[PDB]
Amino acid sequence: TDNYEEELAKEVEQLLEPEERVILQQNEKPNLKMISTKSWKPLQTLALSMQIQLMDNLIENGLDIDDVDKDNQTALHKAIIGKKEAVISHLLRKGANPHLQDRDGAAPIHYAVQVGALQTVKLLFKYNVDVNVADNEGWTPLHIAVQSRNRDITKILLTNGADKTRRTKDGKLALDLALCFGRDFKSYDLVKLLKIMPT
């Protein structure tokens, strides 16, 4: 019963000035240039506000799912940064590119690790992402995992081929990140994982 839509559409039109009405009828579909700015990309905003159907409408009307912003980030990057996991999996099923590095050289796997989204990390493995992708400063997901002090995510990266001899541009191993916090930051547990895993 989408008579609710027609009823609501009429209700709203009855409230509008003639000039507003003309614009509305001129824009059956979303007007990309009028509804986007630098900071606020519609796909990104809709992703963070959990508006999956509205995202699909934009995409189906011709907006590239991998449309990038000023920082070369797509809706997928942002959805992950916001840890919106249902939106994330939807985008991936719709063919969003999980391999793209943004302006800082950061891939979806980098951000999934930073926000500690274990299920998103596992899901990205299924899309065969490069788990050793390095950003502009040579940081890999393993580096970020250890920085976050997360044992589960550190372990699962190592189980899925994370390279523990990869150094940042200034020569840091994930081992260094594990050790540097000293006591009371789960440092020994992380070091143990890094010395034993994989196998």
Binding site: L54, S187, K192
Partner: protein, 192 residues
């Protein structure tokens, strides 16, 4: 124990240190405080802040730990950070405020919290967008309503000369969009 014997003297000295060496743990892009907040490590965030740390430090993109806590809807950490005098008036690299971020991520509790800390609900970024413009773009009627109740100005125009209602007219004819439009047109009338 086991793996500890695999460490050099210098590395063991690091492991047993009573205070973290944060320079090792930091890059311009990934700040340990930001990472810990973003993934929700409350106890560890508090531990770090007990050492020598700038709570308002920015990443390579100009964001602070507050941005990260807010975007990820880490509500307890966000409350804590403000309670520990993190600067709520920081702007990003385009002049957007924390309120813009709280709205984009659809966080009613943070929106309310920012107002208690004297946020300007009508603040405009460089392109003239208010938080209400973002809420309208999100098509979140619950968020739009909250902003209106808290005194958001519907007459503020962005650089294209569009009020939040004006923006609505371009968003595409659809039920959720209509619901927002209705709120925008009706709300001023509910004021006496």
């Amino acid at each position: 124990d086991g793996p500890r014997k695999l460490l050099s003297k210098e590395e063991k000295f690091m492991l047993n240190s009573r205070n973290p060496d944060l320079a090792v743990a930091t890059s311009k892009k990934w700040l340990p405080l930001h990472t810990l907040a973003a993934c929700g490590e409350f106890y560890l965030v508090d531990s770090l802040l007990k050492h020598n740390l700038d709570i308002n430090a920015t990443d390579v993109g100009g964001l602070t730990v507050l941005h990260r806590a807010i975007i990820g809807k880490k509500q307890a950490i966000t409350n804590y950070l403000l309670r520990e005098s993190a600067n709520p008036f920081v702007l990003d690299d385009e002049g957007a405020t924390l309120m813009h971020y709280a709205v984009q991520t659809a966080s009613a509790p943070t929106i309310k919290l920012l107002l208690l800390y004297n946020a300007d609900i009508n603040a405009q970024d460089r392109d003239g967008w208010t938080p209400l413009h973002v809420a309208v773009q999100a098509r979140r009627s619950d968020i739009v309503k909250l902003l209106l109740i808290k005194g958001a100005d519907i007459e503020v125009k962005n650089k294209d000369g569009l009020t939040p209602l004006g923006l609505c007219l371009y968003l595409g004819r659809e039920i959720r969009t209509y619901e927002v439009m209705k709120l925008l047109k009706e709300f001023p009338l509910s004021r006496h």
